[PDB]
Amino acid sequence: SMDDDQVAFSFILDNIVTQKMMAVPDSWPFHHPVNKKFVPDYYKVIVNPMDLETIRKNISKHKYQSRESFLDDVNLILANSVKYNGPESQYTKTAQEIVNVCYQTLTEYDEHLTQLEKDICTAKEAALEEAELESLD
Ligand SMILES: C[C@@H]1COCCN1c1cc(C2([S@](C)(N)O)CC2)nc(-c2ccnc3[nH]ccc23)n1
16 A cells, blocks of 8 residues: 555665764764754754754654655755855865765665655555546535
């Protein structure tokens, strides 16, 4: 079912986050949203904040239906470090390793993720078609 497939897809992504990305050494700056009381300037600069806790919350809500949408938020972590800390900051080097281990692990699971992504997309289109046919009955 689309529910079993979304659960599987989300579990794979969550395991990539907790077992690989969160395990990158010294990755603590990216585990949670920046606290405005600690870094008030952060939210004057960073318009689209992102972090690994927020990604996990999004996974639990089944936000990500595709590898692309998942990686959109993953890359935001890196892009935001480039902007706030600079492209050569040690913070950005760490964010880069987080992104790289994400890519590496996605590649290991690309066969299964690609199939889940396709099957979720077909089931979603079918449910949309049926809902529209029912509303017009
Ligand atoms: C602003 C820096 C550099 O870019 C990425 C995130 N970064 C963070 C992130 C955090 C959080 S947190 C405690 N939830 O705000 C998410 C874990 N914290 C501090 C921080 C907080 C207080 N003093 C500090 N001194 C130096 C850094 C620092 N930096």
